[PDB]
Design a binder for these strands. Structure first.
Lengths: 125, 125
DNA sequence: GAGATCGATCTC
DNA sequence: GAGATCGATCTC
DNA sequence: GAGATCGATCTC
């Protein structure tokens, strides 16, 4: 199943202050749940930087198919953002501080997609 | 300038969790410890590290933060949240919460830079 | 420096 | 009272 | 600054 995502599903996730990021739905380390109601949220683990995890509203998740989605996700986030300042922030290229990990994260997500759900759960959790 | 800095001890409220003892910390991926959600000046967030469960970290609105003095604050925080949650923490969550309180109590007796050095183990994993 | 925003101070 | 404006502040 | 608006008038 009734829920849109389950643990192991690969998803683009959007957090304010980050570019759209390749993630995997994962159990929260403390609560051990992967979804909760605040509107529904899912817990995710960022690829490319293991210590980074977050609760994300369904509205900021998109099923991951490939890097080719990224440009359109940026544009759609900017289209929905109210202020010129947020629009301009959303349209900036990924910063040098983040690019190495974002690239690694895309590579990991593509490798994860080639594995079974239980395999990628074991490797990345 | 800012209300909090890295190393400050704070109670943090996340929906689905009891009020939790935390330390303001640099985000693993952005390296920043504060930011404005959606770039709006009224929406300042701080990044926090949960005591008692190293892998658990989160961005919290300043308004969902209370400076940590001691465990005795917990009941009033519960009461205030119930006004706007009162059943006791149980089970495994209680044990992790109790361990986080003991750590926060130890950290509260230390200087800012002393506790930042002594609690770097919470940044692992 | 560049871009955007927020606000005390003008013209009307 | 309402724009217009010249910033001064904030992020980058 | 500049229209509506109130007071004591001019002048009819």
């Amino acid at each position: 199943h009734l829920l849109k995502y389950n643990v192991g599903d690969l998803v683009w996730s959007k957090v304010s202050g980050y570019p759209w990021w390749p993630c995997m739905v994962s159990a929260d380390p403390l609560l051990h749940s992967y979804t909760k109601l605040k509107a529904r949220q899912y817990h995710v683990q960022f690829f490319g930087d293991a210590p980074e995890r977050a609760w994300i509203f369904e509205k900021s998740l998109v099923a991951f198919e490939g890097e080719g989605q990224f440009e359109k996700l940026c544009q759609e986030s900017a289209k929905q953002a109210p202020t010129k300042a947020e629009k301009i922030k959303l349209l900036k290229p990924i910063s040098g501080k983040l690019r190495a990990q974002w690239e690694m994260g895309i590579v990991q997500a593509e490798e994860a997609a080639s594995m079974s759900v239980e395999e990628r759960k074991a490797k990345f959790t």
